[PDB]
Amino acid sequence: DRIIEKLDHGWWVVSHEQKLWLPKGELPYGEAANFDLVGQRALQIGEWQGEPVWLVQQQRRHDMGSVRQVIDLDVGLFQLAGRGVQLAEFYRSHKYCGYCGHEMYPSKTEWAMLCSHCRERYYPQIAPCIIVAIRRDDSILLAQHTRHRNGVHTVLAGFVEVGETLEQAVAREVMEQSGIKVKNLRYVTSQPWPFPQSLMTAFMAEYDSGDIVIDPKELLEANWYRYDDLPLLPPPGTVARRLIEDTVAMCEY
Amino acid sequence: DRIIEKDHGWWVVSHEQKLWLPKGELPYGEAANFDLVGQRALQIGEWQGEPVWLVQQQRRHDMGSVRQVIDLDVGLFQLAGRGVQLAEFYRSHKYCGYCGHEMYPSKTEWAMLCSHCRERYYPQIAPCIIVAIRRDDSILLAQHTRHRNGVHTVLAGFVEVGETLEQAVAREVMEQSGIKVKNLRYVTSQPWPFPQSLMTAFMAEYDSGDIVIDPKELLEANWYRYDDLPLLPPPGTVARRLIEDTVAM
Ligand SMILES: NC(=O)c1ccc[n+]([C@@H]2O[C@H](COP(=O)([O-])OP(=O)(O)OC[C@H]3O[C@@H](n4cnc5c(N)ncnc54)[C@H](O)[C@@H]3O)[C@@H](O)[C@H]2O)c1
Numbered sequence A: 001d002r003i004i005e006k007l008d009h010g011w012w013v014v015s016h017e018q019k020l021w022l023p024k025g026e027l028p029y030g031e032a033a034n035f036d037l038v039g040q041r042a043l044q045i046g047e048w049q050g051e052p053v054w055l056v057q058q059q060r061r062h063d064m065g066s067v068r069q070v071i072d073l074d075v076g077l078f079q080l081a082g083r084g085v086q087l088a089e090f091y092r093s094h095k096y097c098g099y100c101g102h103e104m105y106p107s108k109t110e111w112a113m114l115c116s117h118c119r120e121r122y123y124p125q126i127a128p129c130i131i132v133a134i135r136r137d138d139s140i141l142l143a144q145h146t147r148h149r150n151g152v153h154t155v156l157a158g159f160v161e162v163g164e165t166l167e168q169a170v171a172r173e174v175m176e177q178s179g180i181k182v183k184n185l186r187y188v189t190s191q192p193w194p195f196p197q198s199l200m201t202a203f204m205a206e207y208d209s210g211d212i213v214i215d216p217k218e219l220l221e222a223n224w225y226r227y228d229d230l231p232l233l234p235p236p237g238t239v240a241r242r243l244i245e246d247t248v249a250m251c252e253y
Numbered sequence B: 001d002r003i004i005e006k007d008h009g010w011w012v013v014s015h016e017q018k019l020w021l022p023k024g025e026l027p028y029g030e031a032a033n034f035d036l037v038g039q040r041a042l043q044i045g046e047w048q049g050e051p052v053w054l055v056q057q058q059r060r061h062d063m064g065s066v067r068q069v070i071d072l073d074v075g076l077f078q079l080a081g082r083g084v085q086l087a088e089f090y091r092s093h094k095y096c097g098y099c100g101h102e103m104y105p106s107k108t109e110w111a112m113l114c115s116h117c118r119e120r121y122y123p124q125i126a127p128c129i130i131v132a133i134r135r136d137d138s139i140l141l142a143q144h145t146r147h148r149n150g151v152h153t154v155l156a157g158f159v160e161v162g163e164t165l166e167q168a169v170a171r172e173v174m175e176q177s178g179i180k181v182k183n184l185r186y187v188t189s190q191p192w193p194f195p196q197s198l199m200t201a202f203m204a205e206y207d208s209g210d211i212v213i214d215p216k217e218l219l220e221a222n223w224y225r226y227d228d229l230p231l232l233p234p235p236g237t238v239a240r241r242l243i244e245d246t247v248a249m
C-alpha cells in the first residue's frame, strides 16, 4: 500500500463496483503520470513479467467495464486483473463491520479488513464452485440454462455449500439439476472466475444411472450429444469448454 | 426455519464458534429433553433418517469446539461443522458491510439480505490446500510453530484471490519450505470448520530445491522414510488421510 509517484509503472487496475477502467478496450500499461494517477493511493496486488500490477480504488468517467473484455490476455495477467476487481469489491463490502456496525479499516500486512471497535476481521470471499462434464459412452450431457438465455449448450455447475465436499457438491448438483447419478468422478483443474468471485473446480464424471429430469429453474433443456455432433459451445478460455474438448478428444472410437 | 415443538433429532446449539456438548457429546433426542420447545431452529441436514437442527443459542455449561466430536462419523461431523459455521455466518452479518444498516436472513437460502442497499452475502468458505510432498521412498513432514505439540504433518495454506489450486500448492510449498514441486495429483477434499476452511488435498513430487523453512510458520521440516515416520496427526484428519495414502506406495 502506497501513494503513487511519477516514476511508478506497470499494469493499472482502476476498479470500482465490479468494473475496471479499460480505455481503448485495454488494460492500462505504463507510467503513472500517463494516467493522472500521481498522488493517488494504490495497492500492489502482484507482478507480471517484471511489472507491478496496481489496484487503484477509483471510478473513472468513461470506459469502465467488465474484466471479461481482457480475457484474451495471457491467463496469468487476466487472473491478476480479476484479483484487483475482486479486491476492490472486498473493501467496498466491509466499509462497516458485520458483527459490530462500526467502520472498518484495512490491514497493512495482508488483504484483510479489521474493526476499529470489535476484535473481528474479514478476508476476501472466494466462492468454491464445481463444474462437471458427464460422459455417457460416446456422448456428453449438455444443457441450456434458464438464467443465461444465450443458445449455448454447456456442462453443469453450481456453488459448493458449507459442510460439504467437492465430491458431494458434484453429486448433489448433478442430481438436483438433471436427475442422474454419476460415477468415476475425477478432478482435472481449477480456475479463478471473478464473476463476481468464484473458484471453479472442474471435474469429469461418467453416467451411472437415472433418466434426465430437469429442474426448469436452472435448465431449459438437457441431453446427450454424440461427441462429433455437438451444438454451440461456451467460448474458449473457460474451463467449461476445455472440459468439453477433453471429453470429446477422449472419444477412443 | 420456524419455532420448535415437542420435534426430534440431532441438536447443534451454537454460539460464538462453540456448540453445546453435554457429557462431551452431541445432544440427541426430543426437543423437550433439552429445554428447546418454543425456540427458533433451522434444519441444516439429515442423518440416518433424522433431522439435524441448528439453534442459535448460548448455554451456561459444556460449550465446546466441534473438534470434540470429530470421533463421529464423517457425515455427521460435517453437519455439526455446518451448524457452527452457519451460526457464525449469521452473527458476522448482523450489520451490512456496505451501508451499515441491519440485515435480516433469507427464507429461501442461507443468506443475509440488506433492505436498505439491496446487497447480500452468502456463507464464506475459505479454500485451502494441503499437500503431501513425496520424494521416492520419502515424504516431507514439518513441525508447526502454531500448535507446538510434537506432531509432524504436511503443509497447508489458504488459497489467494486470483490463483488456482495448483498455484496455491506451488506458492505455499515454496514460501514455507523453499522446494519446488511437480506432478500435482488431486486426491480428495474435506470441510474443516476451524473456522471455515475447505481443504483440497493434493499429492506432489519433489522436483528441486533445498529445505529452507519460514520460522514464522515452521519450526522444523525434513524428509522421512515411509516406514520410519514420527508422530503423525490423529487418524480421521485429512492430513492423516494424505500421509497414509503416500505411505501406501
Ligand atoms: N469458468 C467457467 O467455465 C464457468 C462456467 C459456468 C459458470 N461459471 C461460474 O460458476 C458460478 C455459478 O454458476 P451458476 O450459473 O450455477 O450460478 P449463477 O451464475 O446463476 O449465480 C447466481 C446465483 O448463485 C446462487 N448462490 C448460492 N451460493 C452462492 C454463493 N456463495 N455465491 C454466489 N451465489 C450463490 C445465488 O442464488 C445466485 O442467485 C458462477 O460464478 C459462474 O460464473 C464458470
Ligand SMILES: NC(=O)c1ccc[n+]([C@@H]2O[C@H](COP(=O)([O-])OP(=O)(O)OC[C@H]3O[C@@H](n4cnc5c(N)ncnc54)[C@H](O)[C@@H]3O)[C@@H](O)[C@H]2O)c1
Pocket: A110, A123, A124, B126, B128, B130, B146, B156, B157, B158, B159, B190, B192, B194, B195, B197, B199, B237, B238, B239, B240
Ligand atoms: N484438515 C486438516 O487436517 C488440516 C491440517 C492443517 C491445517 N488445516 C487448515 O488449514 C489452515 C492452515 O494453517 P494456518 O497457517 O492458516 O493457521 P491460522 O488459521 O491460525 O491462520 C490465520 C492467518 O492466515 C491467514 N488467514 C486466515 N484466514 C484466511 C483467509 N480466508 N484468507 C486468507 N488468509 C487467511 C491470516 O493471515 C491469519 O493471520 C489451518 O488454519 C486449518 O484451518 C487443516
Ligand SMILES: [Zn+2]
Pocket: A097, A098, A099, A100, A101, A102, A115, A116, A117, A118, A119, A120
Ligand atoms: Zn466490529
Ligand SMILES: [Zn+2]
Pocket: B096, B097, B098, B099, B100, B101, B114, B115, B116, B117, B118, B119
Ligand atoms: Zn446495505
